[PDB]
Design a binder for this molecule. Structure first.
Ligand SMILES: Nc1ncnc2c1ncn2[C@@H]1O[C@H](COP(=O)(O)OP(=O)(O)O)[C@@H](O)[C@H]1O
Ligand SMILES: [Ca+2]
Length: 375
């Protein structure tokens, strides 16, 4: 753009599309990736200004809407809303044509084979984007935190991932994937809420369950001990008087839902928490590779933003791992935009040119150009 090539960086997942230009610190355009439709019906003369209420516009006028969620855990429920989602991004906020710049996105690690092509097509065959790359999440983070080896656990909204990374990159044989992440914490809440006598069961209320969560519910440091502290109506109970009108006195639910990350005996599964799946990744590798993975355990995404989390893993991780060392969780001050800031650098370095898919390479290699360059 202007005197230089430049581009647009983009982290999109199951909950927020976070768009910006290139070189930038952290995001500019940001919106929930959802498309809403008018479930309230009746008729019209005056109308609340939309056919598809999208992202921001959507989340703001919740009531009439049946919020068609798309990317639940990297898999999209149906792709049709998605084109309107990205129709926001470029033209409406950023005012830039996709048909002009490079695009950086993120690979929501182990998003299916065909989704790679299907995405690149929406750009290159439908909306002729000049160059693009989708970068594989967890690793980006590492470099922005100034780390080369460590065990990263990156989870935002959609899917849990425990990545061992070193001075050279990981492989499917050791890394893991699980469905128990940030948004599942979000949704989980209502399964449990029943015992007080609440269950925001439907659409608009579904979104209020997310909202409650990120600004008040905290992680149990050691749940079991804290269970008797549920008698202490001070720590726990707090008022959420919904600005509509209904008090949700989120007592024990404020840490009982977080705990499911380290405790799947609460939903019903055999998954161990993210502290044990971290051993699960780390063990599977070569024998000499672990000493510095243990020296830095990178912890990022929307998932690691709750109050009381690094500290937890400090205890828990020691118990079933290798013993010998200075074990240490590195969770950056803002650690959620891990994906984004690591990505920024790549789409600011011109060295990145000895990688990407450029506009004519697609035509010259068909849809498959994505697995002809990448994987
Ligand atoms: N302060 C926070 N504490 C905990 N949960 C948060 C916080 N900020 C956002 N979240 C949750 O993180 C998720 C969105 O994270 P995000 O990184 O934006 O996207 P995604 O991994 O899908 O790419 C949602 O569950 C949202 O509720
Ligand atoms: Ca993400």
């Amino acid at each position: 753009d202007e005197d230089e090539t430049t581009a647009l960086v983009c982290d999109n997942g199951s909950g927020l599309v976070k768009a910006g230009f290139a070189g930038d610190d952290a995001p500019r355009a940001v919106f929930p990736s959802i498309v809403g439709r008018p479930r309230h019906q009746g008729v019209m003369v005056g109308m609340g200004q939309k056919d598809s209420y999208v992202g921001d516009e959507a989340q703001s006028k919740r009531g009439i809407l049946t919020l068609k969620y798309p990317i639940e855990h990297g898999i999209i429920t149906n792709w049709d809303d998605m084109e309107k989602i990205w129709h926001h991004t470029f033209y409406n906020e950023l005012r830039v044509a996709p048909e002009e710049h490079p695009t950086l996105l993120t690979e929501a690690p182990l998003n299916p084979k065909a989704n790679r092509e299907k995405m690149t097509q929406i750009m290159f065959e439908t909306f002729n984007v000049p160059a693009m790359y989708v970068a594989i999440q967890a690793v980006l983070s590492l470099y922005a935190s100034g780390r080369t080896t460590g065990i990263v656990l990156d989870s935002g909204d959609g899917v849990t991932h425990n990545v061992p990374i070193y001075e050279g990159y990981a492989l499917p044989h050791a890394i893991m994937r699980l469905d128990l992440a940030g948004r599942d914490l979000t949704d989980y809440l209502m399964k449990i809420l029943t015992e007080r006598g609440y269950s925001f069961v439907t659409t608009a209320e579904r979104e209020i369950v997310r909202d409650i969560k990120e600004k008040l519910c905290y992680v149990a440091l050691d749940f079991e001990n804290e269970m008797a502290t549920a008698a202490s109506s001070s720590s726990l109970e707090k008022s959420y008087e919904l600005p509509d009108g209904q008090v949700i006195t989120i007592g024990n639910e404020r840490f009982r839902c977080p705990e499911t990350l380290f405790q799947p005996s609460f939903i019903g599964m055999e998954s161990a928490g993210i502290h044990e799946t971290t051993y699960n990744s780390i063990m599977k590798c070569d024998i000499d590779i672990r000493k510095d993975l243990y020296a830095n355990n990178v912890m990022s995404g929307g998932t690691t933003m709750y109050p009381g989390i690094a500290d937890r893993m400090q205890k828990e991780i020691t118990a079933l791992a290798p013993s010998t060392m200075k074990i240490k969780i590195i969770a950056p001050p803002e650690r959620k935009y891990s994906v984004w800031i690591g990505g920024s650098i790549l789409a600011s370095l011109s060295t990145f040119q000895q990688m990407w898919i450029t506009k004519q390479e697609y035509d010259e290699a068909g849809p498959s150009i994505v697995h002809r360059k990448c994987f």
